[PDB]
Amino acid sequence: SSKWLDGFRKWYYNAAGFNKLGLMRDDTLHETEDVKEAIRRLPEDLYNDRMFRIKRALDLTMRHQILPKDQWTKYEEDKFYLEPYLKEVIRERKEREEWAKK
Amino acid sequence: MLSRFLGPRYRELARNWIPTAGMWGTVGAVGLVWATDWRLILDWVPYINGKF
Amino acid sequence: TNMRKTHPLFKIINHSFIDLPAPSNISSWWNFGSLLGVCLMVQIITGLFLAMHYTSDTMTAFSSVTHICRDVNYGWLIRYMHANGASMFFICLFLHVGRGLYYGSYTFMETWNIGVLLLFAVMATAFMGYVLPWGQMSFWGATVITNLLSAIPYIGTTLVEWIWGGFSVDKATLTRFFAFHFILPFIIAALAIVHLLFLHETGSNNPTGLNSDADKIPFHPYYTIKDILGILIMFLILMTLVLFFPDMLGDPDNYMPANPLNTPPHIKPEWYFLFAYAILRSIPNKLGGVLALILSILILALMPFLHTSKQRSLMFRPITQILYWILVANLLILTWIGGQPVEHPFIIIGQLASISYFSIILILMPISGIIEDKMLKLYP
Amino acid sequence: SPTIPSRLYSLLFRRTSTFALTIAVGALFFERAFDQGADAIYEHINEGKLWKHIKHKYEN
Amino acid sequence: SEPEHDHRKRMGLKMLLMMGLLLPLTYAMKRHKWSVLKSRKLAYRPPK
Amino acid sequence: MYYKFSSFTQKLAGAWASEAYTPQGLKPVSTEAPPIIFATPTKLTSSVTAYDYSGKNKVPELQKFFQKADGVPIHLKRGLPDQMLYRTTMALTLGGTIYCLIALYMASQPR
Numbered sequence: 001s002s003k004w005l006d007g008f009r010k011w012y013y014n015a016a017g018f019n020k021l022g023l024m025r026d027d028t029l030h031e032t033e034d035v036k037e038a039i040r041r042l043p044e045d046l047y048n049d050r051m052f053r054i055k056r057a058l059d060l061t062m063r064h065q066i067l068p069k070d071q072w073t074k075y076e077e078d079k080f081y082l083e084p085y086l087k088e089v090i091r092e093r094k095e096r097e098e099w100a101k102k
Numbered sequence: 103m104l105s106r107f108l109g110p111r112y113r114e115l116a117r118n119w120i121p122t123a124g125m126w127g128t129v130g131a132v133g134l135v136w137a138t139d140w141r142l143i144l145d146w147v148p149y150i151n152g153k154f
Numbered sequence: 155t156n157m158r159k160t161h162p163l164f165k166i167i168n169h170s171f172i173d174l175p176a177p178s179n180i181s182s183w184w185n186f187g188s189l190l191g192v193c194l195m196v197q198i199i200t201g202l203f204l205a206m207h208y209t210s211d212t213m214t215a216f217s218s219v220t221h222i223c224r225d226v227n228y229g230w231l232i233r234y235m236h237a238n239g240a241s242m243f244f245i246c247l248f249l250h251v252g253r254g255l256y257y258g259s260y261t262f263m264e265t266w267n268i269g270v271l272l273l274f275a276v277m278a279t280a281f282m283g284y285v286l287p288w289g290q291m292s293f294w295g296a297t298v299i300t301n302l303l304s305a306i307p308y309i310g311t312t313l314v315e316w317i318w319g320g321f322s323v324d325k326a327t328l329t330r331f332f333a334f335h336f337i338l339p340f341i342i343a344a345l346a347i348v349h350l351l352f353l354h355e356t357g358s359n360n361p362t363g364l365n366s367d368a369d370k371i372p373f374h375p376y377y378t379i380k381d382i383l384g385i386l387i388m389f390l391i392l393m394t395l396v397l398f399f400p401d402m403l404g405d406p407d408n409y410m411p412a413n414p415l416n417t418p419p420h421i422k423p424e425w426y427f428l429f430a431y432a433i434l435r436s437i438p439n440k441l442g443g444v445l446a447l448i449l450s451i452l453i454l455a456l457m458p459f460l461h462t463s464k465q466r467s468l469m470f471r472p473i474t475q476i477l478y479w480i481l482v483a484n485l486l487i488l489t490w491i492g493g494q495p496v497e498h499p500f501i502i503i504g505q506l507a508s509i510s511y512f513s514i515i516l517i518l519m520p521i522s523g524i525i526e527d528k529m530l531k532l533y534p
Numbered sequence: 535s536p537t538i539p540s541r542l543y544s545l546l547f548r549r550t551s552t553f554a555l556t557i558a559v560g561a562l563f564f565e566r567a568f569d570q571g572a573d574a575i576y577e578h579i580n581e582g583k584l585w586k587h588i589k590h591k592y593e594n
Numbered sequence: 595s596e597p598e599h600d601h602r603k604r605m606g607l608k609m610l611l612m613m614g615l616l617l618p619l620t621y622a623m624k625r626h627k628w629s630v631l632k633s634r635k636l637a638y639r640p641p642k
Numbered sequence: 643m644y645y646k647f648s649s650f651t652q653k654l655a656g657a658w659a660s661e662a663y664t665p666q667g668l669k670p671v672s673t674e675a676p677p678i679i680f681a682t683p684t685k686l687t688s689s690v691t692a693y694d695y696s697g698k699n700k701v702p703e704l705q706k707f708f709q710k711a712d713g714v715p716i717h718l719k720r721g722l723p724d725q726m727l728y729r730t731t732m733a734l735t736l737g738g739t740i741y742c743l744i745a746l747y748m749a750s751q752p753r
């Protein structure tokens with residue numbers, strides 16, 4: 001039942017509500033030390049786009065509004081830009097931890 | 103030792119600040135009259151002659 | 155040259171209330187903690203004007219309370235304002251705690267720990283203050299709470315005798331409870347200063363849970379006038395509660411003098427203790443019930459280690475939102491059960507509510523966060 | 535002849551000291567007027583029930 | 595039991611009128627100071 | 643070389659040969675003019691029609707007035723007073739409808 005899981009994933013993505021604020025999935029991650037290091041390694045255009053998206057979301061939440069439905073972040077164009085940087089940061093931190101174990 | 107404060111510029115500054123200080127003293131006097139219900143003043147104001 | 159950024163007394167006020175950077179999108183719930191401070195201040199002021207006529211002797215406690223309500227000019231206003239202000243203080247405190255739970259504000263760990271210490275202090279202050287008017291339910295609730303606190307083996311009896319100052323609740327207990335009820339709110343105020351200091355070290359939290367550094371505004375005049383409006387609204391509910399219905403939240407049986415010979419058919423504390431009392435009735439063990447009470451307060455301090463998600467707030471976690479509202483619903487159920495007689499079907503309902511409470515806070519919420527991470531293609 | 539908020543700003547609301555003077559005078563007059571009106575309303579609902587309405591049958 | 599009953603109800607009536615006066619006015623000042631920000635328009639100019 | 647109209651004073655000031663007489667750069671081509679992106683563009687419209695006077699046989703000026711050029715219905719076309727009395731009309735009929743529902747529920751319940 002792959003398409004049932006996929007359509008349920010689309011439903012959960014629409015029901016989470018951050019697509020109505022223009023946000024991506026990687027903007028909603030909590031900025032811990034690994035996530036902050038992932039933002040620090042970003043290229044500057046992606047960093048500026050992310051900062052504008054957070055500012056727009058905070059401005060929309062201030063007025064208790066949402067974007068119009070055509071401006072919502074669609075599921076197919078939601079790019080997981082922070083995944084390789086976060087993956088590298090987790091790999092390096094686990095390597096440091098396993099070196100500190102021995 | 104306040105002989106620094108004798109001059110025409112300080113006199114002009116004080117002369118400019120007389121009416122604002124007088125108006126603030128009027129505000130303080132009215133506030134002290136109202137918050138204490140002084141019988142020496144409210145018995146002369148025509149409307150407030152009901153509680154005394 | 156300006157005294158706002160240079161004068162060392164005004165520098166702290168400037169960096170705490172005037173030019174403090176605050177998120178622009180925090181809703182009305184962020185009023186409540188500030189409301190709590192005002193409530194504390196109001197209580198202290200009214201408490202001071204209650205301390206000017208209260209006599210802390212058993213023969214002249216209820217009589218002094220009636221002298222306050224009957225002969226002192228607007229003493230009824232001061233006393234019923236103090237009682238209803240305590241109730242509104244716990245309303246603000248419960249909503250402050252629930253907002254901290256909903257929006258993931260427990261990641262500020264030191265602020266959360268100073269908070270739960272403040273919660274313990276204000277619960278003790280309220281219990282001793284309710285002992286103070288020396289009514290029937292005051293004396294009997296004091297006797298019940300202390301003699302169930304005696305359930306620790308080999309330490310409990312000596313501890314409850316040293317708390318009592320004797321064999322039971324008597325004049326020494328009333329005097330020491332007046333002294334302790336006087337002394338606790340100043341320690342609460344100092345702990346609130348430490349609470350605000352630990353918050354201002356790291357900044358505050360926005361409802362979206364994101365980083366609010368991209369859009370921050372000065373505290374003045376925005377949250378100044380927002381807090382003024384919240385204070386006016388809190389005063390509207392408080393003055394409605396004191397000036398129209400002074401006894402929906404009180405107990406009639408506290409208007410009788412304290413009788414050690416007569417026990418009431420039903421003994422219960424106030425509503426902000428009642429749910430805990432329900433947990434205290436849930437387990438048919440003395441020491442187990444005492445530990446159930448203590449863990450029922452302390453698992454809020456435990457919850458910073460129960461975060462298994464990579465998203466902070468619950469704004470984008472709908473299953474944990476549903477489970478959180480089930481938890482608040484269970485808290486309302488426990489509050490209702492705590493003021494009920496110990497009789498069927500309230501026993502199995504209270505046991506089910508306590509089991510659901512500890513299961514939701516301990517077990518189900520991290521599992522919900524883990525599966526939400528899995529459905530967002532984050533967890534492996 | 536402009537609107538009366540222009541008059542209020544031109545004579546009273548511009549300076550802060552005159553602003554404080556007008557709100558103090560308004561506090562005095564509003565105190566007395568609101569107290570008299572609210573009291574009159576209170577005996578309008580409670581007409582025939584208070585002590586001042588039944589006082590004339592006993593007081594000499 | 596309540597010698598203060600009539601005075602309490604009179605103070606409650608004055609409180610109801612007084613708060614019905616001052617909730618809209620304080621809300622109006624809040625909406626003034628916060629409608630500074632609630633009509634704020636933000637735009638983005640990336641150099642691409 | 644001698645004077646350039648500048649310095650925030652609406653006047654000619656002393657400027658260099660490379661700044662007053664060659665204000666363009668020595669770059670080869672212009673690079674780019676990047677666009678501005680926004681949440682949602684607002685609507686722009688003007689209103690200067692106003693109205694006219696009233697009197698006897700003043701039907702054709704109101705005939706001119708009720709030609710729309712506005713995209714507004716005729717029951718909101720007069721402006722202020724019909725709009726507020728419409729506002730009160732729907733408000734009191736909504737209050738009457740909900741008070742009808744409350745009255746019917748209380749009438750259905752016996753005592």
Ligand code: HEM
Nearest residue numbers: 197198201202204208237240279280283284286287336339
């Ligand atoms: C240092 C400040 C305080 C003083 C001096 C003080 C003093 C008193 C006194 C003398 C009484 C008995 C009079 C009465 O019948 O109400 C009392 C009752 C009470 N106090 Fe306080 N109090 C203070 C702070 C607080 C705080 C912060 C709380 C909230 C936790 C609180 C909650 C209560 C409660 C619930 C009662 C019982 C009300 C009643 O039964 O009438 N008090 N307080």
Ligand code: HEM
Nearest residue numbers: 184187188190191251254259266269270272273346358359
């Ligand atoms: C004694 C009663 C309390 C007082 C006077 C108090 C006071 C405050 C104040 C003034 C603030 C800053 C304003 C705000 O953010 O709303 C605050 C924030 C906070 N308090 Fe409390 N508090 C109390 C109880 C608690 C308790 C019991 C907890 C723990 C559950 C707690 C946890 C927090 C947290 C986590 C924040 C910061 C969240 C944020 O700013 O977004 N407080 N408190």
